[PDB]
Design a protein around this ligand. Structure first.
Ligand SMILES: CC(C)(C)NS(=O)(=O)c1ccc(-c2ccc3[nH]nc(N)c3c2)cc1
Length: 293
């Protein structure tokens, strides 16, 4: 038996782990003995599995299968349906859930030492991703998972793209739902995505962490306040571009160490080439952890 080949009729629904546009993730027991002793796994599937969606999903699956890192969720295998060949991605189950939910739950009971451990791990997962010339395009605390108190992993790759051989950016021609409040300026203006725009987004994740996911302080809430809550639809993007151009930025989170705030603001450079590298961010964060401890 090839253990990466999962028979769908043996997957028992336990609970839903998340849903949105395109897909959902469910906690399931893979229980071929049918006695409730099988392994519990995470199962990602498509809500709307059109030809185009399935094509993208299969690339996503290949991306995840190609990544082996302590801070990247583990690929376990796939399901194929008969006939139209619907696909399910089977992953390890990380029982503490998303980092967004975890931090929202425990708040300041997670101390700065812990937050920086998570930061370093996110940085390392991202640096590793970049070595494979993959661009994540969706880095947010909702996409990061908690294995245990001491380890987080990047948990979703639904928007991940491979760079063209001869280019250092990927251009999206027809944008779908876009997490615009995590986007670099050049992603908003030109739909250009690169390691450097992933670094911009990482700065936003660092902000999320240090606000402890306080809803009033969320990137959407803050940017909307800065451009005006009256702005709607496409005018949000117009005003956001103008704001960023003029160095409008998320504020320093309350109680945030200065060295950490400085990292955020460096990630949020309008000049793409001046943004730090993930290799350097991981070094810098580990040094800060070292100084604290
Ligand atoms: C991507 C999508 C639209 C489906 N929803 S989301 O972003 O809320 C999300 C992402 C990953 C997961 C996910 C993916 C793999 C997982 N392994 N163990 C987990 N707890 C776990 C969770 C769940 C929800």
């Amino acid at each position: 038996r090839d253990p990466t080949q999962f028979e769908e009729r043996h997957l028992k629904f336990l609970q839903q782990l998340g849903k949105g546009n395109f897909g959902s993730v469910e906690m399931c027991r893979y229980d071929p003995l049918q006695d409730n002793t099988g392994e519990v796994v995470a199962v990602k599937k498509l809500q709307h599995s059109t030809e185009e969606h399935l094509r993208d999903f299969e690339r996503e699956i290949e991306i995840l299968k190609s990544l082996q890192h302590d801070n990247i969720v583990k690929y376990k295998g796939v399901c194929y349906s008969a006939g139209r060949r619907n696909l399910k991605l089977i992953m390890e189950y990380l029982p503490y859930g998303s980092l967004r939910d975890y931090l929202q739950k425990h708040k300041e009971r997670i101390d700065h030492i812990k937050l920086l451990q998570y930061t370093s791990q996110i940085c390392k997962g991202m640096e590793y991703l970049g070595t494979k010339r993959y661009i994540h395009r969706d880095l947010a605390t909702r996409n990061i998972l908690v294995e245990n108190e001491n380890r987080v992993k990047i948990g979703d790759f639904g928007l991940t793209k491979v760079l063209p051989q001869d280019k250092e950016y990927y251009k999206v021609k027809e944008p779908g739902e876009s997490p615009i409040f995590w986007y670099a300026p050049e992603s908003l203006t030109e739909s250009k995505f690169s390691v450097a725009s992933d670094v911009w987004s990482f700065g936003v994740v660092l902000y999320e962490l240090f606000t402890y996911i306080e809803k009033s302080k969320s990137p959407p809430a803050e940017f909307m306040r800065m451009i005006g809550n009256d702005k709607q639809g496409q005018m949000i993007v117009f005003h956001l571009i103008e704001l960023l151009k003029n160095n409008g930025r998320l504020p320093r989170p309350d109680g945030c160490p200065d060295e950490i705030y400085m990292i955020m603001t460096e990630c949020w450079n309008n000049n793409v080439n001046q943004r730090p590298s993930f290799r350097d961010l991981a070094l810098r964060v580990d040094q800060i952890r070292d100084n604290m401890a």
